[PDB]
Structure 1
Amino acid sequence: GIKNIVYIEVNDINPLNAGSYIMDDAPFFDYVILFAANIRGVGSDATLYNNPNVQYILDHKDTLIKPLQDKGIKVLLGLLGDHTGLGFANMNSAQTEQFATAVANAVSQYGLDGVDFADAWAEYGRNGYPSGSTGSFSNLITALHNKMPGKTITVFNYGYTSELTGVNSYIDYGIYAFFNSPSWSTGFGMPNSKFAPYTINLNSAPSAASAQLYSGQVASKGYGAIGYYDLRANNIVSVLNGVAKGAFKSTCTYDGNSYPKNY
């Protein structure tokens, strides 16, 4: 049961567009990631910051999130560094529990299905924060798991993720971080059934022939997911139908609904 996991840049793209692709009377995509809320060091606090676009979607969850979940799509909050020098991987123990508390609170408050960690753009070490890893990234996954054990946690395989092997039982999926070409390996010791070794950039899209070939390999090699980054509001069905044929022996169709970002 390969899962299709798509990241949506909510600064540009209305997440409802993920619901416009259909394969076998179900949404093509199984997980939608609202990319992204940020971790921000503010003095000695580790903070969760939702920019106006993220916060608008969360404030309008009944119209911008719930319709996806009503279709059976799991909707996750993306988490990304934001240039303050503090990131997932250089926190002390107090900051780790602060950030875990903030994230779990966001998931419960907005009725989300989980979170995705993308350890990018933290600019580790700026503003007096540690320049290297403190080992906090593994403790953060454990803290968050303990606060919300039935919710999904995915990890984009970028940054300090190599440290996560000891905690990987708490991680549902890992996603390969480079686009349009598979790497037949996994990060942080994940089994193949919990990894996407192939991640399609839906903005700078590959050919449908490359998507069908590589997705068929994802399936025949027993991997459990395929990643998709930057679904836009155009009709990208030729690529997704390539995957449907390759990985799912099926087809994917587009319903024509291009949802605007008018907020």
Structure 2
Amino acid sequence: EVVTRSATGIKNIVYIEVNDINPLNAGSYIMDDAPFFDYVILFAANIRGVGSDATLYNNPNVQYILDHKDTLIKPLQDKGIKVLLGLLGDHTGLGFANMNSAQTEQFATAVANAVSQYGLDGVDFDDEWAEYGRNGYPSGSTGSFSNLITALHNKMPGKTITVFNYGYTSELTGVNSYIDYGIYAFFNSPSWSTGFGMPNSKFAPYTINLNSAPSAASAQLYSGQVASKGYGAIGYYDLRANNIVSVLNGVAKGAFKSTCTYDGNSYPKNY
């Protein structure tokens, strides 16, 4: 543990839609001789109910990245970026919030095992698209969402857990010590609030859509407000392979009193 005040600077957290975009593009933006982005979320592996089993399912693109971790993950980690596995529902009727005890342990074990096997830095939860109650699973919450966070924390206490603030996240207040950051789920305008009891220092109240990007000036002004109000993160959704440095440099100015440059590397998705 620390013995000093030990403030943490604002973290830039970006979600990559890996069905479309090579995640290496997150490394192409440099601020203060370090990567602009602090966390990259590989969006997303899925929770799937398959009979009584809770399963972790990696679609072909997610699985390709994991199978090619030395190519598509480790170069990011070498420059200090933390790479997280995104977790998302998949219309099976089973999600993070409606599992029984055995399913919770099964799913937590599957996730921890993947984090270990592929050398990841943790996970992000997006409780979206479970279609709760399809096909005989419970239609409502069982309390498993908080229990899953606890179980994962115990299995991987040194790894990161982030939560995209959508779905049954109102339940998570009591376990919020185990969650590093929560991320606002709507784009291009702040909401000066947090979810699930999180302090400002553990929340991103502003999430920029890097596909449908706002102006650099809009990002500069809002990110300056994020910083002034003491928030601990800024979210970014859907980084593509185009050069969006103008917007990130707006954030560098507003939140960091610095600049962001592009390294020239545009990585195609050749898989």
Please state which band the TM-score falls in when normalised by the shorter chain.
over 0.9
Distance in 1, matches of 2:54 and 2:36, equals 36
1:78, distance to aligned residue in structure 2 (A): 0.3
1:63, distance to aligned residue in structure 2 (A): 0.8
1:17, distance to aligned residue in structure 2 (A): 0.1
Task: List runs of 5+ in structure 2 lacking aligned partners.
Answer: 1-8
1:98, distance to aligned residue in structure 2 (A): 0.6
1:83, distance to aligned residue in structure 2 (A): 0.7
1:256, distance to aligned residue in structure 2 (A): 1.6
1:207, distance to aligned residue in structure 2 (A): 1.0
Distance in 1, matches of 2:164 and 2:178, equals 14
Instruction: With the length of structure 2 as denominator, give the TM-score of the two structures.
Output: 0.97
Note the alpha carbon deviations across 1:163-199, whole angstroms, 9 max, x for none.
Answer: 0000000000000000001010000000100000000
Equivalent residue of 2:225, what SS?
helix
Distance in 1, matches of 2:80 and 2:152, equals 24
Distance in 1, matches of 2:248 and 2:141, equals 38
The alignment-based identity, stated in percent, is 99
Note the alpha carbon deviations across 1:188-242, whole angstroms, 9 max, x for none.
Answer: 0001000000000101111111100000000000000000000000011111000
1:69, distance to aligned residue in structure 2 (A): 0.2
1:132, distance to aligned residue in structure 2 (A): 1.0
Note the alpha carbon deviations across 1:51-106, whole angstroms, 9 max, x for none.
Answer: 01000100010110000000000000000000101000011111100100000000
Would you say how many aligned residue pairs link Structure 1 and Structure 2? 263
* 1:63 paired residue number: 71
Aligned pairs for 1:115-130 (under 5 A) are 115-130=123-138
Distance in 2, matches of 1:182 and 1:151, equals 28
* 2:145 paired residue number: 137
* 2:5 paired residue number: none
Distance in 2, matches of 1:101 and 1:193, equals 29
Distance in 2, matches of 1:79 and 1:89, equals 13
Task: List runs of 5+ in structure 1 lacking aligned partners.
Answer: none
Please tell me the root mean square deviation across aligned C-alpha atoms, in Å: 0.5
Equivalent residue of 1:102, what SS?
helix
Note the alpha carbon deviations across 1:136-170, whole angstroms, 9 max, x for none.
Answer: 10000000001100000000000000000000000
Distance in 1, matches of 2:156 and 2:179, equals 12
Equivalent residue of 2:21, what SS?
coil
Aligned pairs for 1:79-94 (under 5 A) are 79-94=87-102
1:255, distance to aligned residue in structure 2 (A): 1.3
Note the alpha carbon deviations across 1:23-57, whole angstroms, 9 max, x for none.
Answer: 01000000000000000000010000000100010
